[PDB]
Amino acid sequence: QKAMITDPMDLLRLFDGVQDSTFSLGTVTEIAQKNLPQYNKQTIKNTIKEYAIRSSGKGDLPRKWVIKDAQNWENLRANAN
């Protein structure tokens, strides 16, 4: 049981800031915590490691993050009506 973000609206706010970010995990966390100050970095990190993945740029484009399950993401966008 590793602690994660579960509020959908919070997950959405996380995703819109992880998706396409080229920054390291560290920086990508720090930035997320600003937008989600209630959580502790480890939880954010845990959440990122869960839903996202850092590409390995074959040159282009550089290493960016993507949410692995575009489906699920769309459901969370739908739960927001």
Numbering used by the authors: 520 to 600
Paper text:
The budding yeast CAF-1 complex consists of subunits Cac1, Cac2, and Cac3, which differ in their ability to bind H3/H4. The data indicate that Cac1 is the major subunit required and is sufficient for binding and tetramerizing H3/H4. Rather, the Cac1 glutamate/aspartate (ED) domain is also required to tetramerize H3/H4 in vitro. These results support an architectural model for the replication-coupled CAF-1-H3/H4 complex, in which Cac1 scaffolds all protein-protein interactions and is predominantly involved in H3/H4 tetramerization.
To gain structural insight into the putative Cac1 dimer, we crystallized E. coli-expressed Cac1457, a region that forms many stable intra-Cac1 chemical cross-links. The structure was determined using molecular replacement to a resolution of 2.9 Å with coordinates from a recently determined structure of Cac1C (522–600). Even though the entire 457–606 protein was present in the crystal, only amino acids 520–600 were visible in our electron density, and the 'wing' (576–581) was disordered. As expected, the structure we determined is virtually identical to the reported Cac1C winged helix (WH) domain, with an overall root mean squared deviation (r.m.s.d.) of 1.14 Å for all atoms. Indeed, we observed a crystallographic homo-dimer. The putative dimerization domain consists of residues 572–600 at the C-terminus, and does not appear to extend to amino acid 386, as Cac1386(Py) and Cac1454(Py) have similar dimerization constants. Therefore, Cac1 dimerization is not necessary to promote (H3/H4)2 tetramerization, consistent with the functional stoichiometry of CAF-1. Thus, the WH domain exhibits binding plasticity for different partners.
